[PDB]
Amino acid sequence: NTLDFVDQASLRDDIPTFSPGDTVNVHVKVIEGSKERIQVFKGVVIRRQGGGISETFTVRKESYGVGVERTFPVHSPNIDHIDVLTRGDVRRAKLYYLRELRGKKAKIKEKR
Amino acid sequence: AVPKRRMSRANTRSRRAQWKAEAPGLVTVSVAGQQRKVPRRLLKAARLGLVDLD
Amino acid sequence: PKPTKGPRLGGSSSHQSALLANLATSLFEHGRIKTTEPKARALRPYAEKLITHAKKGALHNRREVMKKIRDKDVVHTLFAEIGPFYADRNGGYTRIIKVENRKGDNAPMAVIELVRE
Amino acid sequence: MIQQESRLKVADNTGAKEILCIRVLGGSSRRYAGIGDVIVATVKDAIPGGNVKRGDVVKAVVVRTVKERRRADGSYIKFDENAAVIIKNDNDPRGTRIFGPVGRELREKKFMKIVSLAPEVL
Amino acid sequence: RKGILGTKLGMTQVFDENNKVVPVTVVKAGPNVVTRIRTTERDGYSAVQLAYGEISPRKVIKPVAGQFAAAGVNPRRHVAELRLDDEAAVAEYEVGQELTAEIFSDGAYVDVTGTSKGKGFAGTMKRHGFRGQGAAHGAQAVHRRPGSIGTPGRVFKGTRMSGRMGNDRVTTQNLKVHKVDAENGVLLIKGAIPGRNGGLVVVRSAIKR
RNA sequence: AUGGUUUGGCACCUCGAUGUCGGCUCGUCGCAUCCUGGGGCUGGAGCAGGUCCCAAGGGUUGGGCUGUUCGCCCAUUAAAGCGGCACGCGAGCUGGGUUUAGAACGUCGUGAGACAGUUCGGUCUCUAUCCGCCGCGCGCGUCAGAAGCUUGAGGAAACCUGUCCCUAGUACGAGAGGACCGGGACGGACGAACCUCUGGUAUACCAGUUGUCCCACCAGGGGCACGGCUGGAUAGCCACGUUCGGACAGGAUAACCGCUGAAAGCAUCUAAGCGGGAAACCUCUUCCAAGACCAGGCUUCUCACCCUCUAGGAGGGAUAAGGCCCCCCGCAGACCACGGGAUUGAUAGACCAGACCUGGAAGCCUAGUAAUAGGUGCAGGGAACUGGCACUAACCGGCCGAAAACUUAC
């Protein structure tokens, strides 16, 4: 992967192990009139498109009756820390079917 | 569309002269002792006895 | 392996699959077959990977081969001598020899055979 | 991506339930309206007792889009519906209450009142 | 105006100090050796000729080997010329001098020149962005053809009709160099530079910025 | 007075056929300029206009109604220009209107029938010879044969614009209102390159599953049903995605503002002269370009061997540098061409490993009456991307391919 020597310089460690299906809350720093604060996005990791530095993962959450999806680069410095709450039990690599499910049907089994 | 006019002999011959065949190149090979010409594309096969030589 | 860039061999993908499986069957059954040069060119990697499956001969690999070969005698030969024969050769189980063009349609012919050196 | 003849739900309490996009303001022959764009819209569905009426030509701002929208930092935001909030010429809501989340793009477009009224800004 | 010959490696992702993402194309600005000086008193124009790439000495034909020997340097695969403006500008290069990546600095604006990808025989829809005709409402076998060609009954020259597309030298202007990695001789250029991976490119200081 | 863009008039042109309106697609030209650019007087205080000169570089929206052009209207916009070219464009498309045969209404006619009145329905043929144009080769030429790198005469492309922030709430103005000049950011539309991201596609990828047949049977699989149907889907191609562009500067100018002054003792931007002055022009940016017959330049390589006629020239043969064919290929490609490799080899395939996609293989064991679940186990399977590896194929090979001299000057 010829560009690996370029890549590893910006690669970011300390990233927790997680898979599509787990429920995580992402600590995202934002700008609100030139001051810092961390906005926590808690939802379900519905996908993860491996690319090394260009790795991206998607977290889906239901908020005030409207579903919201957010895609972040895995090694984005804009994420100070990721915390994994629960491990989900799923049979797919990408959970796109969850875009059509609400409430009771949208729940995820828990890895026991 | 249909040809409006009959081609003259010069134009017909000039265009017709492009329809021709090129001569394949031949290399020498020794099969059963006797030398004979074979295309270089078939050299290995001739050396293996896989092409009929009349 | 690498899918064909152009249109398929038999005139459709399913026909090409059947063609390739039959050609591999005949190749392993006889040891050398004569066919058009595009057919041998497409046949090389396919037969080479079937032989690779046969080399590490387990039940899983046997079933992997059977899901393509469909002929049980050929599978038995492939897992009984062809596999063990190539135990210590890494790739290049087949060779292609170009032969004289066909008469009916001037199709370039080629002969594909297993190496026995 | 909202264009002409597209329908949007109303995220306000003005009595309008659903509007049809007429124009995308912001330059001649402009095509699509993303989060934070102002559109001219006509009310298609309304609450029977509301202040607005069907067929009113109003000005609205898009606050949610189904098509994901890239951000400066390489992250993306995507919602489940296209929603708009009816405004007046001074860029303030004509309603008093905003429903559902909104995008961060309403900050750089100077929709401060809509941002403040929203339940949460993403 | 500085310049160097390089090779397109691929494109990747980096983040600047405001945490924004920068899509960067990696160019191998490998070592170039100056082979010839073009002077006004000799050639009529001032320019400098650079050699790039590594090639086996048994692959170069005799004329090329003789030219490289006359220069005094070992042969390289690729040769190209940089056209300067005046003798005062070309006085700073001399034959055998080696140019590496650090002639550029971070944040500089550069001009990358390469050969575009080949697209083959292309229709007017793709070659020229012609709007098509209707796909229904009675349109008969005209879904992609140009249509009219438009007193003298003559098709004027320059007709934007179908033909071969691509494979032309292209210059992209005002690209910003995000980082100059001196260790690997690699330039990180923000944006997309012409050509396929492994092709030859020329990196020059921008003429405008 | 202009024009033949409107109805005309003539009947010169065609009845051994010149498609009749709009619309779509694609243009090209004019300037009698809609915006942007430079101006001037204002019945111009500023803002904003009015009107007028220069100016054709670019741009000039999407819908409702109607077959429509036209037109009215709805939202915008910097603006929603007017015209020529068979009222451009049917061997490019449409057939809604008009313009055959069917049928009805109103009216006319005793009637057959009729109506530059209405209404519903109603076959749009063709394998491109030549010119033209877009691309691509072969041959020859450029005074020996070749090979690198190039100059450029000459052409082509591109040229749009808004909002906001500072200057400045100042100049002006009773106030309201509202600046000039100059810097900065973010946009719309258009164009190009590209595939890191997003998204699309995926007919040799992975998994689920219905019906049926087969592999003796169970298990496990396979063929067919749009790839049977579904869930995903790397590479390539792409846009809905990313990045970049329109410049800056110089020269000569238009309308115009001027300087220095004659004829014409003053005056006069003028007849001598000299200056400023625009998106137009020439350069400037990008691209093609020596078939540029004035067929260019800087270099580098080979730089020699026979035979025949008759020794005048010619013809033939064999070679060098080099090239081509055959061969292995390519993200180069209709073919051809182009580019790379050819054993002194990583060009392709295989093999090994990785990346990535899928999502937990088979067998066995355990739990359950069974459907099924757990362990072995980030398992197994696999294309394009990357790195190794001569294992297979690039081969004991053919064809092309180098110099009359003379004149003058030095």
CSV table of C-alpha atoms (C1' of nucleotides) in Angstrom, one decimal, chain C residues 1-5 8 13-14 16-17 20 37 41-42 44-46 48-49 52-53 56 59-61 63-64 66-67 70 72 89-96 98 115 117, chain F residues 203-207 215-217 219-225 327-333 348-352 361-363 380-385 389 391-395:
chain,number,residue,atom,x,y,z
C,1,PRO,CA,-9.8,-14.8,-11.1
C,2,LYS,CA,-9.7,-11.7,-13.2
C,3,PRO,CA,-13.0,-11.4,-15.1
C,4,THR,CA,-13.0,-10.9,-18.8
C,5,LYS,CA,-12.6,-7.3,-19.9
C,8,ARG,CA,-18.1,-13.3,-22.6
C,13,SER,CA,-21.9,-15.3,-18.7
C,14,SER,CA,-23.6,-18.6,-17.8
C,16,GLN,CA,-18.9,-19.0,-20.4
C,17,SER,CA,-19.1,-20.6,-16.9
C,20,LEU,CA,-14.8,-23.1,-18.6
C,37,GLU,CA,-6.4,-19.5,-28.3
C,41,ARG,CA,-5.9,-18.1,-22.4
C,42,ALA,CA,-9.1,-17.9,-20.3
C,44,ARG,CA,-5.2,-21.2,-17.7
C,45,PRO,CA,-5.9,-19.3,-14.4
C,46,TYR,CA,-9.2,-21.3,-13.8
C,48,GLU,CA,-4.5,-23.4,-12.1
C,49,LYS,CA,-6.7,-22.4,-9.2
C,52,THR,CA,-4.3,-25.1,-6.2
C,53,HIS,CA,-7.4,-26.3,-4.3
C,56,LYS,CA,-3.9,-28.7,-0.2
C,59,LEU,CA,-12.6,-32.0,2.7
C,60,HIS,CA,-13.2,-28.3,2.5
C,61,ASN,CA,-11.1,-28.0,-0.7
C,63,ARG,CA,-16.1,-29.5,-1.8
C,64,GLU,CA,-14.8,-26.3,-3.2
C,66,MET,CA,-16.8,-30.2,-6.6
C,67,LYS,CA,-18.9,-27.1,-6.7
C,70,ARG,CA,-19.4,-31.7,-11.2
C,72,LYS,CA,-16.6,-37.2,-9.7
C,89,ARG,CA,5.8,-26.8,-7.5
C,90,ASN,CA,4.6,-23.3,-6.8
C,91,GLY,CA,2.4,-22.2,-9.7
C,92,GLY,CA,2.7,-22.7,-13.4
C,93,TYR,CA,1.0,-26.0,-13.5
C,94,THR,CA,-0.1,-25.5,-17.2
C,95,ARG,CA,1.6,-24.3,-20.4
C,96,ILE,CA,0.1,-23.0,-23.6
C,98,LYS,CA,0.1,-22.1,-30.2
C,115,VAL,CA,3.5,-29.7,-17.1
C,117,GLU,CA,8.8,-32.3,-16.1
F,203,U,C1',-23.6,-10.8,-15.7
F,204,A,C1',-16.3,-15.1,-13.0
F,205,C,C1',-17.2,-11.4,-5.5
F,206,C,C1',-19.5,-12.8,-0.4
F,207,A,C1',-24.1,-14.0,2.3
F,215,C,C1',-25.0,-35.1,-7.6
F,216,A,C1',-27.3,-43.0,-4.9
F,217,C,C1',-29.1,-41.1,0.3
F,219,A,C1',-25.0,-33.5,5.3
F,220,G,C1',-23.0,-30.4,1.8
F,221,G,C1',-23.5,-28.4,-3.1
F,222,G,C1',-24.8,-27.6,-8.3
F,223,G,C1',-28.2,-26.4,-13.2
F,224,C,C1',-32.7,-23.3,-14.5
F,225,A,C1',-36.2,-19.6,-13.3
F,327,C,C1',6.0,-12.9,-28.7
F,328,C,C1',4.3,-11.2,-23.2
F,329,C,C1',1.2,-7.2,-22.1
F,330,G,C1',-1.2,-2.0,-20.8
F,331,C,C1',-5.7,2.3,-17.0
F,332,A,C1',-3.3,2.8,-24.9
F,333,G,C1',-7.0,1.1,-28.1
F,348,A,C1',1.3,-11.0,-17.9
F,349,G,C1',-0.6,-15.5,-15.4
F,350,A,C1',0.2,-18.8,-11.3
F,351,C,C1',2.0,-19.1,-6.0
F,352,C,C1',3.0,-16.6,-1.1
F,361,A,C1',-17.1,-21.9,6.2
F,362,A,C1',-16.8,-27.4,6.2
F,363,G,C1',-16.2,-31.2,9.8
F,380,G,C1',-14.0,-19.4,5.5
F,381,G,C1',-14.4,-17.5,0.5
F,382,G,C1',-12.6,-13.9,-3.1
F,383,A,C1',-11.5,-9.9,-9.0
F,384,A,C1',-9.1,-5.7,-10.4
F,385,C,C1',-4.8,-2.5,-5.4
F,389,C,C1',8.5,-15.1,-6.0
F,391,C,C1',6.9,-21.9,-11.3
F,392,U,C1',4.3,-21.1,-16.7
F,393,A,C1',4.8,-17.9,-21.4
F,394,A,C1',8.0,-13.9,-23.6
F,395,C,C1',11.1,-18.7,-28.2
